[PDB]
Design a protein around this ligand. Structure first.
Ligand SMILES: CN1CCN(c2ccc(NC(=O)c3c(NCCc4ccc(Cl)cc4)cc[nH]c3=O)cc2)CC1
Length: 298
């Protein structure tokens, strides 16, 4: 097939500065930072992830996949640092993961945001489909927030979460772009319920039988039958019957044009999330700072 001509950028340790710890646990630690190239008069906000041969091999296989993608709704690797232990340098997504974002800002998330996020996630997934890349772990925890109006898909570096998996994936370990559609349906459910845990209290071993009986996730109170029907269609036993990601872009885009007709949220219209319109929306020198999406460009 087609040769992968993606460029792997090696970054010098001295070219980037760690500001603070964004999150630490199990794997290691993630830092908020700045990448100041050679003499380009630019400061790029970045996320830095930081010795056994097995772990080094796993982080490089991750880097390979992340460097092989370029889409506005997919998280891309900026580069790698080859210190004692390999460091991954990625674009900063200041608001963190979407799962935590909806749990923390539920009282200010209107129908427009929820529907636009569904479009954006479907666009990222459709791109991954065009690139023949099967995610295998799509969930609200693996969707990052650049701005409340711009989300990107991550953790496709694995390319088990039973409660997000399609029937074929649990029983036969079959992973396709249609099995990713099931996980998309569960992700949409997570957003529509403002970060509720799917099949909460129910053990993982029962999920297979539950799905075979015909039982699915409940209709979120804010969901019109129009939105819920789409989620239900993502959870058909027959994978070919499930919607394609390009159909999900169109369907959610139609709905995003008149959001209050498809999502019923009490307090909607008077709700607001941070945006560039806000005073001081963007710690040290905030001079010559530019986002990775506007720098160099592949
Ligand atoms: C109250 N909360 C405090 C913590 N806040 C937070 C903000 C940004 C990140 N950033 C990220 O998680 C992040 C990534 N996380 C996915 C895991 C990962 C981290 C770093 C690399 Cl290099 C690769 C993968 C990946 C890329 N860019 C990011 O900003 C994490 C947490 C959210 C608000």
């Amino acid at each position: 097939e087609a040769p992968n001509q993606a460029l792997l950028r090696i970054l010098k340790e001295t070219e980037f500065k760690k500001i603070k710890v964004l999150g630490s646990g199990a794997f290691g630690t993630v830092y908020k930072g700045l990448w100041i190239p050679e003499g380009e008069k630019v400061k790029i906000p970045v996320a830095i992830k930081e010795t056994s041969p097995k772990a080094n091999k796993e982080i490089l296989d991750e880097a390979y996949v992340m460097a092989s993608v370029d889409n506005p709704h997919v998280c891309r690797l900026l580069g790698i640092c080859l210190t004692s232990t390999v460091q991954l340098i990625m674009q900063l997504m200041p608001f963190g993961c979407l799962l935590d974002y909806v749990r923390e800002h539920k009282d200010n998330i209107g129908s427009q945001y929820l529907l636009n996020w569904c479009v954006q996630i479907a666009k990222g997934m459709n791109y991954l489909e065009d690139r023949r890349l099967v995610h295998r772990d799509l969930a609200a925890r693996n969707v990052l927030v650049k701005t409340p109006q711009h989300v990107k898909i991550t953790d496709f570096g694995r390319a088990v979460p039973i409660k997000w998996m399609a029937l074929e994936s649990i029983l036969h370990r079959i992973y396709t772009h249609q099995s990713d559609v099931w996980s998309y349906g569960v992700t949409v459910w997570e957003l529509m319920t403002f970060g509720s845990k799917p099949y909460d209290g129910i053990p993982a071993s029962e999920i297979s039988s539950i799905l075979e009986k015909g039982e699915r996730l409940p209709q979120p109170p804010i969901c019109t039958i129009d939105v819920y029907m789409i989620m239900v269609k993502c959870w058909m036993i027959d994978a070919d019957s499930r919607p394609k990601f390009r159909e999900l872009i169109i369907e959610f885009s139609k709905m995003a044009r008149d959001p209050q007709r498809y999502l019923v949220i009490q307090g909607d219209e008077r709700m607001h999330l941070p945006s560039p319109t806000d005073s001081n929306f963007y710690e040290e020198d905030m001079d010559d700072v530019v986002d990775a999406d506007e720098y160099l460009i592949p």
